[PDB]
Design a protein around this nucleic acid. Structure first.
Ligand SMILES: [Mg+2]
Ligand SMILES: [Zn+2]
Ligand SMILES: [Zn+2]
Ligand SMILES: [Zn+2]
Ligand SMILES: [Zn+2]
Lengths: 56, 138, 170, 175
RNA sequence: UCUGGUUUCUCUUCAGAUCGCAUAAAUCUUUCGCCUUUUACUAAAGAUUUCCGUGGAGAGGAACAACUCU
RNA sequence: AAGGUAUGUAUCAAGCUUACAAG
């Protein structure tokens, strides 16, 4: 997706302040997907919550 | 600018946002400018300097002044506008005018010691105007 | 003067070419894979029909062929600079391998591509004013009285000692 | 395809009507913010009306934005001259590029220039802030007439008769 | 009334377990298969390693640790 | 990929190398 003789794009002045577009993110509704709703699309989903996961 | 928490952040973020926008613009200028003339490692002192002043602005704005609440303070840390680590070394007793975390790492140094930025100037020898080679000065 | 369309939308594609399509061959609906697919399909639909002779087309009387290119891939191109030329038969006229030599047997020393690239980047006797500049037999224009005094010196010329033979002209 | 546009996308366009025709310069506002703010601010002031193109090096550049017409008069909307804003994907590889004109250090004013060809000697020396939308690059190739009379400045240089702002990002007022 | 500790970071050996609810590459020894010779190879067996990871253990802190299991 | 367009000498810079011991 990039031509030759083009140095690979320099992440400071090129896409640092560019916001990303949108992820895939299938929309979950409440009243059926109520438990998983707060955390289901999160990098590690339950990470800082001692009730459901080990720890960090 | 990337915010990475989709939060619509709490209050009062609107009164620190022009300040933090100014510090980010100065950090882009202190990140982008060339390295000719600036010798080898004095061209990387200013990013530690402005990182220090950004973390210190949120530091004395929260613990000292008690203007910002706890939630927005934890927000500014968890986004990236502060160190989680360097305020934890600012809270400890003997050192809260600290330069940055490289003068505490005792195995960055070859002799197993802390850098001469972290020496009480009153009890060093009188005239030597040494600047720390890592962090920038004392 | 080319008048502009005067709209604020910029000049080119929105994706900035990130779906560039490689459309250098026959397009998808007219491609020979699609014609084969049409023939396959219509031979599948007419099966209970037995020679109703409505003819349908050439092929359909009863994915190989020219194969379709991936539209989403520019091919990585090099230059094959290294020519296959017998160095011998180019500069001598004799290869010891005869016609068994694996190279070309060419004798043309036309330039290569890279060579074209790296050229592509780059009076007078008395030394006075001409006081009657006057001539002799053989083009010798001298000043007049100065060449008379020259004849008083030597009867032949000054430029190449040619025989003036008394002849002196303007 | 295989052609690869190879430069960042634009935002904000200014149509600019000189006596050689209409030129629609579209700006890299994000990639060079202070210079594009300067240029739309001055075009919004109508600073550049009756300003001539006082230097043509045909094949290399054509300069403008001097309302005194000698090659030194430029007054930014910052008061002092401002900083150069380079970018690794904005280089002088082609015609149609528009760049502020510098005299050494961070000295950028109103005086800007079009390119007319390849200008690799100017890389990391001038702030590219806009390209020219095609079918109107020929109107600024009208600006390169071999009439130069000197090393610069031909007989009747083209003057900027108006300057529109077809799209205005980052809110402003004139003076 | 007294008893009183989960996280996170580094080391410390033991691993006998689907250490891994899946699964790489190498070396050697033989049989294959393409083969002209050699590395690139083939696809089966045997025995070995490397590598990406994990399990239980001693120690040092720091992280609310004083909330309180006990 | 090698197996073919040889290699072996004599003068002329950047590449790379320490930025040192020193009356
Ligand atoms: Mg052999
Ligand atoms: Zn310090
Ligand atoms: Zn420091
Ligand atoms: Zn120091
Ligand atoms: Zn031959």
């Amino acid at each position: 997706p990039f031509d030759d003789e083009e140095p690979p794009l320099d992440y400071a002045d090129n896409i640092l302040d560019v916001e990303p577009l949108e992820a895939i993110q299938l929309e979950l509704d409440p009243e059926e997907d109520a438990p998983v709703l707060d955390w289901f699309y999160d990098h590690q989903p339950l990470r800082d919550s001692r009730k459901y996961v080990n720890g960090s | 600018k990337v915010k990475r928490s989709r939060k619509a952040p709490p209050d009062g973020w609107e009164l620190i946002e022009p300040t933090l926008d100014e510090l980010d613009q100065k950090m882009r200028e202190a990140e982008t400018e060339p390295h000719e003339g600036k010798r080898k490692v004095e061209s990387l002192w200013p990013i530690f300097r402005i990182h220090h002043q950004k973390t210190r602005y949120i530091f004395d704005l929260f613990y000292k002044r008690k203007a910002i609440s706890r939630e927005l303070y934890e927000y500014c840390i968890k986004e990236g506008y502060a160190d989680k680590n360097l305020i934890a070394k600012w809270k400890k007793q003997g050192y809260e005018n600290l330069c940055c975390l490289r003068c505490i790492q005792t195995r960055d140094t070859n002799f197993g010691t802390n850098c001469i930025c972290r020496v009480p100037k009153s009890k060093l020898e009188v005239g030597r105007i040494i600047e720390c080679t890592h962090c920038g000065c004392r | 003067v080319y008048k502009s369309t005067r709209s604020a939308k910029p000049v080119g594609p929105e994706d900035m070419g990130a779906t560039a399509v490689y459309e250098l061959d026959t397009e998808k609906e007219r491609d020979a894979q699609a014609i084969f697919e049409r023939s396959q399909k219509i031979q599948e639909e007419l099966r209970g029909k037995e020679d109703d002779k409505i003819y349908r087309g050439i092929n359909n009387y009863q994915r190989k062929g020219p194969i379709r290119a991936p539209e989403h891939l520019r091919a990585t191109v090099r230059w094959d600079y290294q020519p296959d030329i017998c160095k011998d038969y180019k500069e001598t006229g004799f290869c010891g391998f005869g016609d068994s030599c694996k190279f070309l047997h060419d004798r043309s020393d036309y330039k290569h591509g890279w060579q074209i690239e790296r050229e592509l980047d780059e009076c007078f006797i008395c030394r006075q004013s001409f006081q009657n500049p006057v001539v002799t037999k053989c083009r010798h224009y001298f000043c007049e009285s100065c060449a008379l005094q020259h004849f008083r010196t030597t009867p032949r010329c000054y430029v190449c000692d040619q025989q003036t033979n008394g002849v002196f002209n303007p | 395809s295989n052609i690869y546009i190879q430069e960042p996308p634009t935002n904000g366009k200014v149509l600019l009507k000189t006596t050689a025709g209409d030129i629609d310069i579209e700006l890299w506002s994000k990639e060079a913010p202070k210079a594009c703010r300067n240029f739309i601010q001055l075009c919004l002031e109508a600073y550049y009306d009756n300003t001539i193109f006082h230097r043509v090096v045909p094949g290399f550049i054509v300069q403008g934005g001097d309302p005194t017409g000698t090659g030194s008069g430029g007054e930014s909307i910052y008061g002092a001259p401002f900083k150069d804003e380079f970018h690794s994907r904005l280089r002088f590889n082609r015609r149609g590029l528009v760049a502020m004109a510098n005299a050494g250090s961070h000295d950028n004013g109103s005086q800007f220039f079009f390119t007319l060809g390849r200008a690799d000697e100017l890389n990391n020396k001038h702030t590219i802030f806009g390209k020219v939308t095609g079918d109107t690059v020929y109107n600024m190739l009208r600006l390169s007439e071999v009439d130069i009379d000197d090393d610069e400045r031909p007989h009747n240089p083209h003057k900027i008769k108006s300057c529109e702002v077809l799209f205005n990002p980052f809110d402003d007022i004139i003076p």
